[PDB]
Design a protein around this ligand. Structure first.
Ligand code: CL
Ligand code: CL
Ligand code: CL
Ligand code: CL
Ligand code: CL
Ligand code: CL
Ligand code: CL
Ligand code: CL
Ligand code: CL
Ligand code: CL
Lengths: 341, 341, 337, 340, 341, 337
């Protein structure tokens, strides 16, 4: 079962788990055949019941120094609320310098849950895309390793340079579910990361990313196409359903969530969520064959990397279960591109 | 000899050394009797000849996960240029949660070398102190672990909470050489960190810190008093002098440096610096006895922690030399307070 | 005397229709109109949002009903407080004894269009309190200046005033703002809610007024309720579900910007989420008992929003079966000068 | 006349209680006036004038009790008193309720009204640039789709007018400036100008026309409207004193858009004398002479005239014009008018 | 013909006259018994017909170096439109340093005619008073000759010092016709300058100034009380009237003028002005006895200095006429206070 | 004819002294004065900073010298460009043919006092170019408006003008700004530097002017130098070291805010750091050869700053031994209308 080596991605949910636990689980995931970690960049969890939000950048240093996994932010908003783009560039450059060939910088337009804390105007999605495109320009200038200046609508950078660089900069991955930003990702950056969705919408995002890259003279067959999915595995279908309902009610909220400020808001909205609202959106089953079929389908659509978030608190059992029953049976095309320098 | 256990601090100079090297050297320093690491928070080095500036926050995660050392920023400016205070609080809380009893948050008013890159008005020292005091208020509110709001002159914080906390928050250490801020440090924070200076000026800072703490009802005898010094050790006096002159000319710049924007500026100013300009200010000698006497004197003034920066590139030889000849012979008072929760 | 309030839902109905229905409601025993101040409806399915201030002039000139905004946010997004004051003063000058100015902290649905920083609820309360101070200064009829955190008013005066200014009614469901309403304003307007929460708001309003030396027994206490009447219980339930899903959203709604957002959230709403929150029944006796209960809690005015599109049938049904059977205490205070 | 008898009545919010204005407009309808121009003020020019109703509420009353056409003359939709998005909603609501009757008159505004919000007051040329941007915003909203806008002066997040008429109301620009007249023809539906000498009126008409042609429109089907101030009374003497006491700003032959307070105008009024009104305000009891004055303007090519009597004798004035003036005015047939 | 020496002030109208002419006329005025010059600080004239506006600060250097007259601005608005208060302080200090005992700094709330050119929000009078009071605080701090900082609502001053100072700073004179600001002038400054007005209103201003000074512990008997008047002298009453009407129509504008932006605006308003509008407000007569009586009356009200602006272009004839017929016959109380260090 | 420029160092000398020395310099063969526009001196030891604009009026009225600012930053810290234009126009109106307006990008030492963001050099160049546009519009003598990135000018006009406006001279050591100076302004002012760098600046200024259709051979090319003359080489060296340590600071100084900062940095400065940068000698022949060399490179004006406090002896010494022996090309252009 597979032309290429066995591999899979593990989603580290900072929303839900203490960072000490996540470190231990990633070390275990490595042992069990996972090859890469996607790590959320939150300040707040969605709900109090999830109850965590570690500073990912400190944690990534620990992961880098204790595993040989690849790893990335999924995703950092470098648009000047929590984080100035110049600093994100330095962080990315430092991590890749220390852990060459292992880091990938995942960026996106952000959500108010996290960015509202600094008490600034929150622009509409389209405008935040414009801010993201400018941030990408800044990160890329800094990645050249020369002294650079920048003056655009949203950011001003005085004479700045990254003195600590890797020989080759880390790839910039854009996390987006928007067709416009997908095109811009292919045009401006190295790879795409998208959440799970129906086939039609995934195929549109891949398509836009590809035509953006070609339009800019790049070869999209050598550019990574990554997906993050939310699943619930447990010992029975019953515990799998309840796990999703209690731990990840935001997974049943089929509506835009980027304007909602507080965990307490999501928690109140969660009172509406029912098991039906998860179909198509979060796979809830104990049947590990069905997990494998779900994942294989995504590979077949043309994703070259998959990052899996189990929503239950049964993270250790989940990692071992996927290691034995799922990861070995996934067929990856050989020499598929992966987020790496 | 000594009433308390043998110990000393190592300064990790991000200005000069690749972060991979610093990690290895800290691991070695642990083996050789150093107990704690002070880590610079820079974006730029002072000169191109120094030639580095890793993102400290990622590096600290690696240090935490691979040593048992105590460690701290020396120092982070949490005043909304590079870093918003809310984020510094999250970073500090995450580090201490992962490495309990090991992290201390060192903060200060910042220098333009690092903060100018975001292209905002750079206030005079006194005003930056006002900004620092407000930032301290924000960090402390977030450290309570409750949902907090803040609205002052410099910062606005919408409903925010740290979900990922240690049982006990890390100490806040203020890095300053100003009598006013020393008093405020004793009043508002947990400990003081100061650079090397003549006895009279050190005794004034200690004195102000103490009376600030008493005025606020605290016991200053249980609050850490920390100093950071720059030395040059090498095989001969000649190499020790040249090491300082080539690697750390800013050490011969007896003047306030916090308004100067570019490495290229310091480098041009360095052309003026001569060996004479270092006396009193950087100890330059191969005589390890004289190193020990210098350090012991500081202990006797009442410092409870010393962090030593060797300015030469001979970091490994320096660590081994101090481990054998210096650290074992330093007499620390027993039950002296140290930066720890 | 027999009376009841009619809620004009600008979210749902063309303003020409609302005018005709208010004229009919007058004929059928309703005495007062509460009129929403929206720019956007909650959902596209509701599909309207007339400019209330123009419409109120038409209502004033063609009926003898009392009427009020429920509610205007005078905090400098859509509307500067100085202008709200002028509008209020003009309406009351033209229709003396008939207008009441209802104000509140606003929702992003309407205010986000001007593209400014949207503060948290508590901060918007601070803005509302400042706006109240501005409106009250202007209502004195003198030349006034104001300089606070949120608003600046250069030398300004209302030359067109009534002999007595219209009452300022605050629309809120928050205990803190209820107390401030009693302390600073003339009366309270609250949405329908369980008895425990209504009794707490009334209580806070009352003790706010007493703390400031006022007599709360002479200050109006107004409630707006959402009901669904139709020919059968079945159509009543479906009417609520299709036309007013926001009534099943028991959670803060003031940060959500777009109708399209509410419409997507509506997919979650179910009939169960309306109990206690929207009365859904064809039994007009049960409508009467529900309303009488609210009178007895101590509300002196009730404004009724039927959520169905069957507005004409609803008005006639209430006129025959409900309004004549409601017992109002004599000399209950009402929003008026 | 080739076309039906008609004339416009100016409702002076500066001077009269809005209840009175409503009654007088109802009377004006009865007497052959066909349209109302309504000032959008916050403050009167002088305390002696002593009023300033909120026009938008009043217009709802007018719409519901008459069959007259009516318009703002003029609203400044440039974000002092009024954000352009709100003006659009107001306009769309009025036309939805009173289809074929409303016209939205806009202009660059005066400090008398806008200074109350305590913001920087730009020079006329800059306020024109703000007006042009406001026009763009109103027109996008009038499309009835969800629209966004980001220009120098205004930001509009996702917004839509759900309550619209089948056809949007015309946008009329009130200006006396050659540049803005051209832009009005290019961008909007019709022109409104104050009284002035023939040469200056002919220049404004000319600029409006060539602006419209340059943009591919037919200016012969676009309204050309003028607002004039007259004083009619029982004798020449009362006509003169009425103007002097009630409308001294009519003798202030100088730009007035920077002056902030009624008390300022009132102090300046002490300078004004009867002589300063010649050319600028017709002051006579001779209704023939009123008719000749108005006919002249029709002949220059104005298709609508709005008349403000400055005296407090509004009822007598309306009846006098109804009997002696309006019936004798010769309007070209099928002349364009501010409407659907 | 007087207890004290013969003296009078000459108003240099920059609105009307080329600065080369004004210099020559002041030199003549010195010869003819005038002792001091008041110099307007305009950017624009009131009307194009007046047709001038020299930069007063350059001109005052020429006056200082070629006469022995006292001189002052009447008045400079130091409120950050045309002029930042720190610069006004430097200008004042430099003039008094070069011409000790001769300069007095006259300040006021400004008019839009001059300040509108920089395109900033123009506040109402009362607010501009608040700005003036803050400016006064800044000028006074700088006048101490120490390194000073300031941070208030309207102005920010970083570490600043006047290195070039006189031994004693020049007096600050406030030009105002407002009872409130008159009181504040006595409380905060050194002297009052007011325009002509009826006796009742002048007596109120003097009275308020005096009680402001006493309330703040100062001695108002040693503080100058100065008035600026506009007169029209010519060979006949007819030319005197026409001179005023054509050259100074703003003198017949009995209304607040501080909001009007353009000369073209005043010029259009001037078409309304008639001879009658000047009574009480500008003395128009060829009878030099009547000029003397007018001026003596003001001395008797309690003014210690009078500055006379002849509105006609007949400046030379006016100076000679006053020198022969008026100045010698004015009775000044001996040792009356005068604007001087 | 014999001529030379005198630099009036406001940083070091009381303005009363500078006036007297300029009057003497006129007597001794100097023809023009360059006057610093400072708020602060470099060091407390220098100890002065008169407001130059007032002083220039005194100079104008008591000498027949030409004079100019060297240089004013008209970029809206200390000085708004509209005001600089008025000042320039007034001076030239009073002293026709004598004033030249020297402008530049400014230093923080002077501009930081108003407590605004201090941009990097390149950005300050952009600000300077916009300021030049403003000054030039005002110099047309018509009513003008301006709206750019950095400045806004409402309807403004200079009513007091000379028949011909004063030349605008840009003080810069940057090749980019030199080209822009030739393109936009009337003349160049540069500090002393090696031949290669001076020849590049002249070259860039020339090709900027040609590109814009001007004749650069009729446009002034001015240089400002710092020298130390005294009775012996020893006193000349010590004078430079004690009075003008900033002359030994071979590094960009435009970001340093305080005199106290420069004073502390001065503790590093040694005699060696002045070679190439400040001529330190008692040999007046060597002074003459230094100056003649600059004339030969193609400078048409030289302004000399003696750094010692021996200003009177210096002026007399140059008058006798230097100025008479300098060979200037006839009909060389000079800063004048
Ligand atoms: Cl993978
Ligand atoms: Cl599907
Ligand atoms: Cl230690
Ligand atoms: Cl010592
Ligand atoms: Cl009711
Ligand atoms: Cl209940
Ligand atoms: Cl008409
Ligand atoms: Cl005098
Ligand atoms: Cl009197
Ligand atoms: Cl020369």
């Amino acid at each position: 079962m597979g032309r290429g080596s066995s591999r899979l991605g593990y989603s580290a949910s900072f929303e839900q788990f203490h960072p000490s636990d996540l470190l231990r689980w990633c070390q275990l995931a490595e042992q069990e055949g996972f090859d890469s970690v996607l790590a959320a960049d939150h300040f707040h969890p969605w709900t109090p019941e999830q109850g965590q939000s570690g500073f990912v950048w400190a944690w990534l240093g620990a992961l880098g120094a204790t595993t040989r996994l690849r790893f990335g932010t999924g995703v950092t908003p470098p648009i000047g609320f929590r984080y100035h783009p110049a600093i994100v560039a330095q962080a990315a450059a430092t991590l890749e310098a220390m852990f060459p060939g292992r880091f990938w910088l995942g960026i996106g337009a952000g959500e108010a849950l996290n960015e509202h804390i600094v008490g600034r105007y929150w622009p509409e999605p389209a405008e935040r895309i414009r801010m993201l495109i400018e941030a990408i320009e800044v990160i890329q200038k800094l990645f050249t390793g020369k002294v650079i200046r920048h003056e655009g609508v949203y950011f001003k950078v005085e004479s700045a340079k990254l003195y600590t660089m890797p020989d080759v900069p880390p790839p910039i991955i854009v996390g987006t579910a928007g067709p416009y930003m997908a095109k811009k990702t292919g045009q401006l950056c190295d790879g795409l990361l998208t959440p799970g969705a129906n086939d039609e919408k995934l195929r549109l995002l891949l398509s836009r990313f590809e035509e953006g890259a070609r339009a800019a003279g790049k070869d999209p067959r050598r550019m990574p196409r990554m997906i993050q999915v939310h699943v619930s595995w447990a010992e029975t279908d019953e515990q799998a359903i309840e796990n999703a309902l209690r731990e990840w009610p935001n997974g049943g909220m089929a509506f835009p969530k980027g304007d909602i400020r507080n965990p307490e808001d999501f928690q109140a909205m969660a009172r509406l969520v029912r098991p039906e609202h998860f179909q198509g959106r979060v796979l809830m089953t104990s049947d590990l064959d069905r997990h494998g079929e779900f994942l294989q389908h995504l590979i077949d659509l043309g994703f070259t990397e998959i990052y899996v978030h189990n929503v239950g608190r049964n993270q250790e059992e989940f990692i071992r279960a996927y290691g034995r029953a799922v990861i070995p049976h996934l067929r990856w095309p050989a020499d598929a591109p992966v987020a790496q320098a």
